[PDB]
Amino acid sequence: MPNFFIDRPIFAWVIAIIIMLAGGLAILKLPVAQYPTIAPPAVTISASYPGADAKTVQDTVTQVIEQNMNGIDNLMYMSSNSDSTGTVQITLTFESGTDADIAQVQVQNKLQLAMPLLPQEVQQQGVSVEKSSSSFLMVVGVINTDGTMTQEDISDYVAANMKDAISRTSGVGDVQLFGSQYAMRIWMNPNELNKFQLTPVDVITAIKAQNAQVAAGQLGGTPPVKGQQLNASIIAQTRLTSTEEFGKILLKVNQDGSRVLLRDVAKIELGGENYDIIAEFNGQPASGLGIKLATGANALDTAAAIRAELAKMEPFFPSGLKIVYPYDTTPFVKISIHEVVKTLVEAIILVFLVMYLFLQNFRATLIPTIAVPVVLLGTFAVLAAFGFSINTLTMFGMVLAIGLLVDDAIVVVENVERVMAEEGLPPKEATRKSMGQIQGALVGIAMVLSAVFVPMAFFGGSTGAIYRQFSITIVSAMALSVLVALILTPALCATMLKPIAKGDHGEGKKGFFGWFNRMFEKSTHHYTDSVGGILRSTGRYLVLYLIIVVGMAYLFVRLPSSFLPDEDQGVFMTMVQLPAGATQERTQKVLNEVTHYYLTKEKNNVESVFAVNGFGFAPRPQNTGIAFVSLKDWADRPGEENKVEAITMRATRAFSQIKDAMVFAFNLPAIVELGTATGFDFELIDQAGLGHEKLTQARNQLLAEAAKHPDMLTSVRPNGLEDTPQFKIDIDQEKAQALGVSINDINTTLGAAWGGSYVNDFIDRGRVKKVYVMSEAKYRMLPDDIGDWYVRAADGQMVPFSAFSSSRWEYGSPRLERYNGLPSMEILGQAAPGKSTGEAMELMEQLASKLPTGVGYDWTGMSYQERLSGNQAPSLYAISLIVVFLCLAALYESWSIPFSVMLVVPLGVIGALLAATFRGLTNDVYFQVGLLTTIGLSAKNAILIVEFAKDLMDKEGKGLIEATLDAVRMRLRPILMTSLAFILGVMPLVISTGAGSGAQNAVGTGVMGGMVTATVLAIFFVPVFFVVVRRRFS
Amino acid sequence: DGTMTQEDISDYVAANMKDAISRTSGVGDVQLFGSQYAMRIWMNPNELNKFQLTPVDVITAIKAQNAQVAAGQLGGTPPVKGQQLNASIIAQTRLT
Amino acid sequence: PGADAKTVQDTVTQVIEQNMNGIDNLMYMSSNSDSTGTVQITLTFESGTDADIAQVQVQNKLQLAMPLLPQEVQQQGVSVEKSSSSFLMVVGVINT
Amino acid sequence: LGTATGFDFELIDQAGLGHEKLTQARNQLLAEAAKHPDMLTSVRPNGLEDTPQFKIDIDQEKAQALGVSINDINTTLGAAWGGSYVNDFIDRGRVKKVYVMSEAKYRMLPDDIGDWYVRAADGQMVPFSAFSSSRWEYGSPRLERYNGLPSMEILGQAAPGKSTGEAMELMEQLASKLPTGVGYDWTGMSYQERLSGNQAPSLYAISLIVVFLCLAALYESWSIPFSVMLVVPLGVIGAL
Ligand SMILES: CO[C@H]1/C=C/O[C@@]2(C)Oc3c(C)c(O)c4c(O)c(c(C=O)c(O)c4c3C2=O)NC(=O)/C(C)=C\C=C\[C@H](C)[C@H](O)[C@@H](C)[C@@H](O)[C@@H](C)[C@H](OC(C)=O)[C@@H]1C
Ligand SMILES: CO[C@H]1/C=C/O[C@@]2(C)Oc3c(C)c(O)c4c(O)c(c(C=O)c(O)c4c3C2=O)NC(=O)/C(C)=C\C=C\[C@H](C)[C@H](O)[C@@H](C)[C@@H](O)[C@@H](C)[C@H](OC(C)=O)[C@@H]1C
Ligand SMILES: CCCCCCCCCCCCO[C@@H]1O[C@H](CO)[C@@H](O[C@H]2O[C@H](CO)[C@@H](O)[C@H](O)[C@H]2O)[C@H](O)[C@H]1O
Ligand SMILES: CCCCCCCCCCCCO[C@@H]1O[C@H](CO)[C@@H](O[C@H]2O[C@H](CO)[C@@H](O)[C@H](O)[C@H]2O)[C@H](O)[C@H]1O
Ligand SMILES: CCCCCCCCCCCCO[C@@H]1O[C@H](CO)[C@@H](O[C@H]2O[C@H](CO)[C@@H](O)[C@H](O)[C@H]2O)[C@H](O)[C@H]1O
Ligand SMILES: CCCCCCCCCC[N+](C)(C)[O-]
Ligand SMILES: CCCCCCCCCCCC
Ligand SMILES: CCCCCCCCCCCC
């Protein structure tokens, strides 16, 4: 194949171009992400029971729905929450690989059996089934710069003109309105209602009757009479459109003939469906859309489509209304990937310079510099075929690949330039001879190297999909690299390499190059003279090698391990959690303090703050709040102290002062669904119908016991709310029966007044919206206001609530949790410093075993994936070692000689561990995959040295020591050519600061440190390994 | 130990075992060989006839007196600003 | 039955349209509401979209919008079918 | 497919202006389009015009004063005049619908409205004429919506010797001079022609580049391929 393309350079060029077109066309069409989607699919059922307490919701909705959730494929677990706001949220989590489309269809197929058993009020609020991520992709804030519109006016506009179109955009799994759409608010007055002897029941009946859309048929409608000439639609009652129209709804005509209108017994205004969520952007009033990414959907592509839909709306905004972007997770992905693309382009340039230093011919320098772009672009085409995406790991696979790509090129170019220098053949014949003697080793090496990376594509579950990206990328690159090294690189050598005279090693060149050539030829002569002496010792360096393996073993064992570094993403969140029973006003006091801190203290770092009252992870009215903090560009805030980790740790420390409120600023982890580094997610189960009060006691007992082990467990706390005072009112059925008052009228009057009642729909400026009846605030604030509410008996007399009701204060849950259909209580916590999660969970199980009768436990979220198959690194690298040995045994046709290559592994590991240890890095994904790359090159170096030596001993019949010296003499220039080119190519990564520098620093440090030790040691030790091994086995 | 009848076993299976098994991996349809407990009101027509009542009166009463009412909140949104108390109103719960 | 364009639009078309969220690969959506007492909402999807998945996601979002439609419309039923103007043939049945 | 020159335009109410103001905005666009016969042909709405409809107002006060329930009134009207699907029945083993409606001769003209009586609480039969007033108004017998918002579909095509892309560009220009809140969008063939027309250049290019490169490999020269590639017009001329 080399011989063919040496005679056909234009053919070789055509293949390279087609590969680059395929690669180029792939880059335009390939999806872009931060990581591959490893998170398990989650379908969330959300229903709303207006005016319902936590238990009413649980025992009429949650349980009824949960009991129908059965025969659902690939279901891991099912958590549910039933809170005092009237909300239920059942999350069904599915196995990794589950089709989210089918999971939704199945979950919804079962919910459809439960729907008819649910209350009519819960049905009419719409039960939603959604397949989205639990955290926000972005937040689209909307403000008024002219201050022409209030917080409510903006919220209604966003809901009525923007919300729906965004919800229908592909990849948008869920959209949360930070505010409420307007409804027709009928604020009932009990003084006026009783005065005219009317109830909330009469108001609801009147609205339904007089806010009706009546289908009245047609004049001359079919079937018609003969000779009918007129056909016209009959328009009867239509929906009311204004506060005024609702105002003049006739409730009753008094005996004297005077009219009682709805406005005579109620304040009628346009106002939110609910008054629970109130948002502020940089202190001023705002609304917006919390957009959640659909399961398996592309963040960047979806974010783009969202922005495209917002661009359509902007032209038709009212005066002053303006979109702001106070939280976006996509820009980091778009910018952090561009930073890795930049270090790729920089490495290709930094290669060209080191390539020009040695070849010293602009045309010869391009042969390795052309090969790299062709393979990398080629790899993008292979990714596309295999259905992978342009993510951080694939993009870093390309960066680490560059090392393996130039070596293939350098080996081919260097060996041709040598052949010409030793014999004085023309470029075409020198290439033909050169390709003839290394093409076998190149193809063979790629199979030996593939046995290093292929194994880490066979890791299990979520953590395995991460490694499989690097593996397939690097392996695809090597496959193309060898293919390009047999098609193109030979053809380019034959045409572009300058004819070199016999005995011309430069030296005769004038200037810098002249000095360099003489300095290198004496360095080569010194090196060969130096190695000559090393081999006469042998025993000295075998004792020195055993020291390095012990030093390696020591550093590796003490060096801590992680998964993926926490990156500054130019965004973070602050959670505000007050004790349940705390008011909207008290939460806003804390949110103001949080917003104040970021706008005053962190004005240098923080760009914007989007604070939301009555929202957190989900809507949790009154006692809960969240702040979305977007920072300034990474360039505008240099140093560790101005990065998210420092900012949030200062913020948490500052917010610890705040009273009767838990306030935490936290960075979003590398992957949310893997949780913290050493945290656990524990579930306490009621297995014997003990009840909530007994389960609360069982939890308190466990938490108390967990506190008595600070040595093992750190900050073990519940992920729920505590019981609060609740107003228990008993309706005396006998007294109600005696006075002639129906319980329907009683319950409707209480619920409609204090809870609110969704009557029917109306048309607000051409859009269908809700009509809500409810007590005016001032008549539903005090317990004593209960007696102000009158119900009409059958005999016509108005009866106060005080007449047929008794009340008392009691305690109950504002948020009832269930796990796998049983009453539960989520408990979070991490292992104490030094102790592992496995040791911590073991103690939690032990402590949980001592709990009262009927109390079980379980592990969920991150803890579920931990007790699942893990720690399979010894297994897969035991195989890798065995396969690498066998592959070398086939190459050299020897069971013994492979050891001469396999003993160089530690020479590269020691450098990685030293550099990683000294810079305070950890044994993470980026360190491991960068170490495999270093082991790959140092092994590839060792293969060619032993190959040349063995070839001399077999083909030329030269002696062991003479062959070793002659081998290392020819295999020095190409080794140092690769080391410099790769060490200098990953300099940008090591010094890197800005977006995604955490990964770059981690990749670059482990590689640079390794390559340094892997080069200087190998050139002296590979000879010692070959001579020791060949002597030992004869 | 003969402390549970066919009915008692069937309820425990239906109420504590069936649902968790029906959600286990690879499990399709789950048929209960028995019945879960319901609240059984066994009506006597002679006693109903005596007090001039029907199954209609019994149903109407059970729906009225075995109700789970959504009764709203004290100090709920929108509140009168300065409100300190925010408490759920618990009306009728299900009979147990 | 007996509904004007406005009545259909403001009780059926708008309610259904408002609930057509979280459906994958939707390009655009169009609807008619006329005095023949009929509404027809057409959802056109991206080329290569599984029409079965497209249809099931639409009828599922409709199922949860059904309780918000009038009794008269719920009773009649709301059909969700794959759009097609291409017949193999039209068999005419006549009485001579 | 429709027509290749034909476009499919959607005039959109983006600010809750109403049906009537969207009708006026459409009439304005239809008029301006007619003032460019050189570019646009048969610019016409794919919709129905407003028609006379019989607006009847039930007086709530007279109904409540006469003891006539509004429910019985709106049922009597809807059931008689519009028809009402009551429940099902089995005809020869097939479940079929039961419909109550007025016999044609009692639901033809406005004069028939007063012949329909509703029973009051006191059992007296009150005619519709007693508690109702009627007038003529205009309304839509077919209300269109596009992407959730009120719309009006406009059909048309590029005039003789003009491209479909040119006609669209003018329709967009004329649309940018319509009342505040009146937006527009492309649908059907127009939506697809915009997307499928965007990628046409890239394919034509990729085709020529790969053909060239393939001939270059065959002949081992960058020059000779042109000798082959120059043939393209010799076939196209005769076809045309
Ligand atoms: C480790 O996890 C963290 C971040 C996940 O990242 C997110 C994006 O993913 C989350 C998931 C999957 C949840 O389940 C959450 C949750 O249940 C919360 C809160 C909100 O606090 C949350 O905020 C989340 C939450 C996230 O932000 N609890 C509630 O809403 C309710 C009803 C009550 C609150 C109880 C206390 C106050 C809470 O337990 C507190 C003691 C801490 O333990 C948490 C705030 C944790 O903060 C940290 C840094 O210790 C987060 C769960
Ligand atoms: C190129 O297209 C043609 C035929 C397709 O062949 C068929 C088989 O396929 C059709 C399709 C895909 C439609 O969308 C139709 C349509 O929307 C219609 C009418 C019914 O006319 C139709 O009849 C069709 C129709 C066909 O018969 N409009 C309506 O019903 C409504 C609600 C209002 C009508 C408004 C006017 C009156 C109409 O716009 C008129 C001005 C012309 O524009 C059309 C009649 C076009 O004729 C011509 C001559 O240019 C057809 C769209
Ligand atoms: C020699 C070094 C080789 C290494 C090259 C590495 C480059 C990798 C870049 C990946 C990140 C950017 O990937 C980004 O993807 C989007 C996806 O639509 C592309 O978007 C593209 O959309 C359409 C597709 O027909 C094109 O007409 C348009 O010109 C282009 O913008 C961007 O042009 C590209 O910038
Ligand atoms: C299905 C599982 C299979 C997995 C096995 C694959 C891994 C094996 C890797 C070995 C790589 C091949 O290594 C191969 O070794 C032989 C000597 O033994 C070399 O040399 C031999 O073949 C060349 C081919 O032109 C000839 O000159 C001559 O027959 C001999 O010298 C090859 O040039 C080299 O390419
Ligand atoms: C630097 C950290 C520790 C890691 C060490 C690995 C890197 C090695 C760096 C290069 C060392 C080369 O050092 C080399 O040592 C050998 C002996 O061992 C010397 O050789 C000398 O001793 C030998 C042994 O008796 C004699 O046969 C020889 O005639 C004499 O010159 C070489 O003259 C010297 O060049
Ligand atoms: C890094 C540069 C160190 C000295 C370089 C010497 C350059 C001089 C060129 C050769 N000379 C003029 C001495 O013959
Ligand atoms: C990017 C295209 C590179 C073209 C290089 C051409 C050199 C080979 C031609 C040989 C002429 C005899
Ligand atoms: C060389 C590429 C092989 C592809 C690897 C797929 C294996 C998936 C691992 C799942 C195990 C739980």
Residue numbers in the entry:
A (entry chain A): 1 to 1034
B (entry chain C): 146 to 241
C (entry chain B): 50 to 145
D (entry chain B): 674 to 913
The authors write:
The E. coli AcrAB-TolC drug efflux pump contains the inner membrane H+/drug antiporter AcrB comprising three functionally interdependent protomers, cycling consecutively through the loose (L), tight (T) and open (O) state during cooperative catalysis. AcrB is the homotrimeric IM proton-motive force-driven H+/drug antiporter component which recognizes and actively transports multiple drugs (antibiotics, detergents, dyes, and solvents) via the tightly connected AcrA and TolC channels across the OM, leading to an observable resistance phenotype. Four different entry channels (CH1–CH4) have been described with putative entrances from the periplasm or the outer leaflet of the IM toward the two drug-binding pockets, the access pocket (AP) and deep binding pocket (DBP) inside the AcrB pump. Here, we present 13 X-ray structures of AcrB in intermediate states of the transport cycle.
In an attempt to prevent ansamycin binding, we made the switch loop more rigid by Gly619 and/or Gly621 to Pro substitutions. Surprisingly, the crystal structure of these variants showed propensity to bind either 3-FOR to both L protomer AP and the smaller AP in the T protomer in the same AcrB trimer or two rifabutin (RFB) molecules to the AP of the T protomer. We assume that the Gly619Pro and Gly621Pro substitutions induce a switch loop conformation mimicking a transition state during wild-type L to T conformer conversion while the HMW drug is bound to the AP. During the L to T transition, the HMW drug accommodates in the AP/DBP region, mediated by the flexible switch loop of the T protomer, in an induced fit manner. The intermediate positions of the ansamycins observed in these structures appears to precede the binding to the DBP as has been shown for erythromycin in the MtrD homolog RND pump from Neisseria gonorrhoeae.
